[PDB]
Design a protein around this ligand. Sequence first.
Ligand code: TPP
Ligand code: TPP
Ligand code: RP5
Ligand code: RP5
Ligand code: MG
Ligand code: MG
Lengths: 632, 632
Amino acid sequence: MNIQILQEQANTLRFLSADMVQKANSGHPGAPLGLADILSVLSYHLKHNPKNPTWLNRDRLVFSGGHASALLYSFLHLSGYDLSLEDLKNFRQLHSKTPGHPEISTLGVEIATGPLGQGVANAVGFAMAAKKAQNLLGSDLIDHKIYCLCGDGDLQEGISYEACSLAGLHKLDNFILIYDSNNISIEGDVGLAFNENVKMRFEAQGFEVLSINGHDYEEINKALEQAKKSTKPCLIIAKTTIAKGAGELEGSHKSHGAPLGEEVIKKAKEQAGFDPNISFHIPQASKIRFESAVELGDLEEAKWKDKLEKSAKKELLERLLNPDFNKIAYPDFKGKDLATRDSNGEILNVLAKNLEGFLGGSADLGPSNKTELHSMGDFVEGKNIHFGIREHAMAAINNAFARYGIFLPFSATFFIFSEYLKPAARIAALMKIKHFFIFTHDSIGVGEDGPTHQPIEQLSTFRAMPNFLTFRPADGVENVKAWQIALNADIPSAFVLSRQKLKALNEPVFGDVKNGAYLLKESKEAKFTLLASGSEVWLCLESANELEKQGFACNVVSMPCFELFEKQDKAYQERLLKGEVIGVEAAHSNELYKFCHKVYGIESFGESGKDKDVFERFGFSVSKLVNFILSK
Amino acid sequence: MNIQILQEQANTLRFLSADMVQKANSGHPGAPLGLADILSVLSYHLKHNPKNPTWLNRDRLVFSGGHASALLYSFLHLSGYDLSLEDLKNFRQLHSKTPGHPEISTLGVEIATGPLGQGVANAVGFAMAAKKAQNLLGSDLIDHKIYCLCGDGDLQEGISYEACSLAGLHKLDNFILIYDSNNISIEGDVGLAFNENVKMRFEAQGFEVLSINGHDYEEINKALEQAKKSTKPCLIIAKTTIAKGAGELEGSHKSHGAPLGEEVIKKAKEQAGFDPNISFHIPQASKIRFESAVELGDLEEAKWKDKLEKSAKKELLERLLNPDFNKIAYPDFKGKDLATRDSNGEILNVLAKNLEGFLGGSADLGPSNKTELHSMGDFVEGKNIHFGIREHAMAAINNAFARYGIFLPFSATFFIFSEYLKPAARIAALMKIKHFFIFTHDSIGVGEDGPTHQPIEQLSTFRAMPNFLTFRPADGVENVKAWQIALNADIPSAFVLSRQKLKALNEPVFGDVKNGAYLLKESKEAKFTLLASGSEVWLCLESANELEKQGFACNVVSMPCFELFEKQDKAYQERLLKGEVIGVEAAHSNELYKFCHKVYGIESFGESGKDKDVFERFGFSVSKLVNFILSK
Ligand SMILES: Cc1ncc(C[n+]2csc(CCOP(=O)(O)OP(=O)(O)O)c2C)c(N)n1
Ligand SMILES: Cc1ncc(C[n+]2csc(CCOP(=O)(O)OP(=O)(O)O)c2C)c(N)n1
Ligand SMILES: O=P(O)(O)OC[C@H]1O[C@@H](O)[C@H](O)[C@@H]1O
Ligand SMILES: O=P(O)(O)OC[C@H]1O[C@@H](O)[C@H](O)[C@@H]1O
Ligand SMILES: [Mg+2]
Ligand SMILES: [Mg+2]
């Protein structure tokens, strides 16, 4: 560890990054060049095993500025991860292992980033998760750091403030945040849009704040040493020059987001002592020094595995890693009228009791979402997490809990406020992680709180989002079966739950919840089929009885999950969907036309009133639905 | 102005609020009771005309904690606004003027609130708008204050930090923020989730911070006096007790969100000297004192109208209030191949030149969204607003610009990051305000930036949202006609625009953009109709040519706006939608089943690659679409 080696290392990172962007004719060279000195030093402090990216006590590295991907990829390649030089040469190309922003399918990537702010919140979540894992497994087994690299953009996003608020409160002295302060964004000087006293901001949230030149190797190293000893979450404010090393592009906003150009790279390499007529060159000293992570990480993991073998907590870790969902005895809600917020809250309690790694909480709405895990304590000693009024950061935090390696997290709020966390929900879908979203107060049934609190379009959004199951159970029994699917599935799920009491259903006649839709009533030569979800299923059962009394044979279909029904074969769908099919939902859900000839929905916003008054106003009554179905 | 009158006034506000909640058996009495002393004093400082809620230079009052509605309504009633005592007795009832959270259809309500955080951001926007209005009209005509009441919940939301960041940067010394610091939220003690040094936080963002007892009338009054003289945006941290005055419920979380109960109200009234056996009682001194706002506000407005008549800026104000959209000469893009981000950016420039009140900006993406208004300067002297990486606050800010009274605002970002601002977009829809959303980079056509940057489900979301037009123009000409509709419509619109170059269309054969969908190609006895929007329309024109060469008559339908097409009559829809109708869109857009027998979409997330490689991978090619249409 000396200046000549660190300089060559940093420059190696620079020109791999620069050459990658240039070959793709696409990407972001500025931030890589600006961060290259920092990551060169950080490589000496990071504890990780390139050959086992799943090692539980590794330091977690997050690039919150995901546009800096070329740098990450360079570093994973150089350090010994399963990413090749040829992979680097296919940066940004279809089906490569080096996509434009980082994805977890590339080994070594902790969490997908790209949407700004998420990664900072993810890093706080990894730090919380680590403090919980320490609670469960002991500080002999869990003691690692969480390093996050962020930029101007990340810190302007609300979610950064939310998550850092929580990091201060919980005294996350395992969290180190490195701010790339280069005074440049896409619109140019960051002073056009931002002039906070960042040090004072973070100290207000309980951080220790260090301030460095991010191109001075000794200063970087001294800050990391001091940060690792902090009794607070720690922010390093690293002053850097965007595209450091790229001559005429140093400090230029034009370097943020477009290739540096062949002649600029040629000059840069000349000034650093690199041959300008070759690309993707790794000098020898740098190569050996970066790849020494392989031997060192192997040894650190072995030393840890020895501590595990002596630990009283081996059996526990194996249950966390291998949860048994099939043994769980769920509540039996058959014939019980209940609001599905209530059935779901009982289910949450059963899961928390059966699964040592199942935990979560609400965004200040525990008592209304019914998500309190009774007698299970408050984080960190217990399982209930009090996220505050921070839906977005809650979801990003729990995305990281779900990636940590031993946790099954849930996030809760009113379904209307799913919109505040939707970007993080999307990253859960993109990753295909097991993170459960609990959304109560699902419709105009909310009543008096009025239109700003009554979901209309949210079901469409979550249904349209790929890799994401949206369950809307009609009763407790459907709510159970939904959980059983959710825990076994390979993608995240949301639970869309009522404020108001719903009526228990009769048993399936054909199919079940696992088919997405199923028959509750089946009639030979059916003229109509009424298809509904959640709170609208009883309206449909009643309306079908009235239709039958009038001489019209009817099928009634419960559809607790649209996405699962889409996956059913033709023969199944044909048996359910007979005659003229009418879909009925307290939502604006045009997607139902995929399965329905007519849709009886809500096309406007809601109203403030008693639930029974609002449902009647919006047409959710037997007499009105039967008149629609009979077209008169 | 003395203690006995202020106490009676505050208690009048308390018991109207409490009695309203009790009669509804629904609502939030805690915050009203806690804020009642503050608003009693604030009533002496507020400049407003109850009989003309549109007076341009009124002080703007925002209740960011919209759950405190009962208090607002009590105050509007008492002050002389067109809200009656009978209206108060129908709190939270279907079709009343006193819905559970405030709505702009109730005169005197500045902006709809309810979703926490929005109002604080709205208040910053009203303060920016006021600084712009001052730039245009002079400080002789615009000099008012913006008062915002907020709670714990508002300040935990990210959007509060975003908006206050901007308030500091822009030195909004017309903005006064009153924080109801009662240490209680729904989950109880706020310390469970939040322990920031709030003073230090705000000072880091450029605020002056005062700290008071919010039940001491002289302290409240002295803070307001000092706040009105601040050279900074100012925060008053007002320590209050939730449900102050309600005995056993003082300081209780149970008072947040449920009626206080008849016996608690009886005691409260006894202790305050009010008769406990009557409800909705306004004592005489309080009545006369509150309603004096009528005479005083009339006089303040008259004095202002005199200043207007002497002003050089009368003609300008009349053009701002009465924009003439029909005279605008738009660019003629007929036959020109362009990315619609580019056509739209030319249109933005034309509008900014023709409309003195048209302004806006991007969330750090001006150069990529193509929204820079060239040669028009930077806010406040000019029209370009640099919002930073703050999509959510941008939208909430611009919602307030749209309510200020003289502005036509636009908000811009990548369509994928519409998800960060969607809750504010919703409030624009709920209010039916003229606020324009510019969303570029609309699909997998984005290419290399990959799946976190490629919209899939966002079209469904915006289509499903009521009162919101979603235009996805196929070329420059469609982009123009979309703007022409948008400016004349009574609801907000989004523009969904491409990164990549699109091909100019031939002229409509039947119908036009104003019908939402229209024919580009019409064939007698058509066997198929290919229906598309935006970038997919040329794929459809080409595929229809290939189908015709194979012997199949085809109609091609461009659908730049789904919502407008939904409103067309039967006869129009029937002429367009002939034979088997196939919808084609680079989105997961199941809503198309409303108009299409088959849908050829994207059902997964995207991929990082060259645009032509990704489109081919996802099946957007003539050969693949023709093979689907011919089912083989
Ligand atoms: C939520 C969000 N909004 C917008 C963007 C678009 N975007 C990509 S990088 C960037 C700004 C980069 O600023 P900074 O973090 O200062 O990066 P640097 O210029 O220093 O590379 C933006 C706005 C994004 N990725 N995420
Ligand atoms: C964005 C958002 N999330 C959640 C809620 C639900 N909600 C209503 S009031 C409230 C908390 C109230 O806390 P505070 O502002 O401290 O109000 P107080 O208890 O002092 O009345 C919440 C979480 C909401 N209205 N908006
Ligand atoms: O009866 P629930 O819906 O559980 O309570 C509704 C809550 O939602 C918000 O309006 C209030 O904050 C209130 O506490
Ligand atoms: O060519 P465009 O799409 O305009 O630039 C793309 C931008 O989007 C982000 O990935 C980068 O920040 C880059 O500048
Ligand atoms: Mg920067
Ligand atoms: Mg509070």
